[PDB]
């Protein structure tokens, strides 16, 4: 149909290539962000069911853009490699010219700008990745959560999920989290993200990856034994 054109504006008002991007986000891993008062917890699936895989050199889904800016993603791994690279360069650009450390909010916009640009320029596909960019603003200790979409726009939610079986996760996020009050403690906040991920992973120590990002360049990924500890405690409740 109109899938062969981008320039052609379409009376449907909807260019099919754009629709098809969404199909692509769905297929990918589930990646979730839930934020406290002092933390972003990012719980994400990393598949590891692959036989004869040396896990050490296989890239973790989470990639440090900046020293305090992180990215998780759902959608095609190849296409996603371009966003990570543009975004890294721009990170260091920011410091080189403003001196100021990376404004996260600029960065959210910069990234979306690329998925937008390519919607207008024929002969350049719109990317079929949606991302989570999360960070902490210069001179600030309030957590910051953003999602980008392949529609070439951006938005902030109090907590959000993307990728396979996101429908299932969204019910959890409505009932156990609230915009009004995020779980004040870091600890509360991490335990709920583990329970959400369990709904679609259905038991895995390394299939669940938790990276907690705190203010002031504090990045630490939870220990496999500690992750295992969240699971067992939760699993006792399930039969009660």
């Amino acid at each position: 149909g109109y899938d062969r054109a981008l320039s052609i504006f379409s009376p449907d008002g909807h260019i099919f290539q754009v629709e098809y991007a969404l199909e692509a986000v769905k297929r990918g891993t589930c990646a979730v962000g839930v934020k406290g008062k002092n933390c972003v917890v990012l719980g994400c699936e990393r598949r590891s069911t692959l036989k004869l895989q040396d896990t050490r050199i296989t890239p973790s889904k989470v990639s440090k853009i900046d020293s305090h800016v992180v990215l998780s993603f759902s959608g095609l791994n190849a296409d996603s490699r371009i966003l990570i690279e543009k975004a890294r360069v721009e990170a260091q650009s920011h410091r080189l010219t403003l001196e100021d450390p990376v404004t996260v909010e600029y960065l959210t916009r910069y990234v979306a700008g690329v998925q937008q640009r390519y919607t207008q320029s024929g002969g350049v596909r719109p990317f079929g990745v949606s991302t989570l960019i999360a960070g902490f603003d210069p001179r600030d200790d309030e957590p910051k959560l953003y999602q980008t979409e392949p529609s070439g726009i951006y938005s902030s939610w109090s907590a959000q999920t993307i990728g396979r079986n996101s429908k299932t996760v969204r019910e959890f996020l409505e009932k156990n989290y609230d915009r009004k009050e995020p779980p004040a403690t870091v600890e509360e906040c991490v335990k709920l993200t583990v329970r959400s991920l369990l709904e679609v992973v259905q038991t895995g120590a390394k299939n669940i990856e938790i990276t907690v990002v705190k203010p002031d360049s504090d990045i630490v990924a939870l220990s496999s034994e500690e992750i295992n500890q969240y699971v067992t405690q939760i699993e006792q409740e399930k039969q009660e």
């Binding site: 899938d3 981008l6 290539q17 040396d54 050490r56 050199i57 190849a78 002969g123 596909r125």
Partner: protein, 244 residues
Amino acid sequence: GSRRYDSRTTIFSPEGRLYQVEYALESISHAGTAIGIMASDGIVLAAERKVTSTLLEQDTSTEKLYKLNDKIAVAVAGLTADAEILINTARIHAQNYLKTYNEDIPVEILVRRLSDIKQGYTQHGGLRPFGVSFIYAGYDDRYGYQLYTSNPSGNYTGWKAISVGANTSAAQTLLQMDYKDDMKVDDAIELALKTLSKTTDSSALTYDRLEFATIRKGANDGEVYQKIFKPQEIKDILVKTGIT
């Protein structure tokens, strides 16, 4: 669905899964088998040749195996025509990096950059994806011996052992079944020869149908020594392993 659209990379399939990429899989698999086994004491690269004519000189062609630099070698499977652009760029890029920092290229770097051109041709430019898979065999001191594979799509995944091109599934079922976790380098050669004889039409696995190289950390005083074995040393070791 019905009307399959795929003229350009930019034009999406209804499915959303670009058919040009799909056709790329077929092509890879067209070519014979290549196999990389990473061992704790070397890497072994062993493959059955594409060519089969005796008139055509199989012996002087190591179509599968080219070295890019002193530490890094690649096994190639797919489209010969397309492939030739990428092997050449990869050598120059490696030497560009050595110019800059006066250190050997890290394995991980060299793959990620090449994968990114492969994406480049779908991201922009009608230009077909250059549908080729390499198995990279390299060494760096960041992670030791490292093995990678690259998808035509333009993404990579590490592996403990992998097979590419034709009959990937059969060779894969055997490797995992008898896998020895530690892996000795002597062992890897034996194990490789067993897998190829079962997937190779000649079940006597003639030498003239074989390409072989071994990259060894088990080379004196703890160093990395790449050695391309000629058809005459393949033949001597064929009689050592006893298939003939």
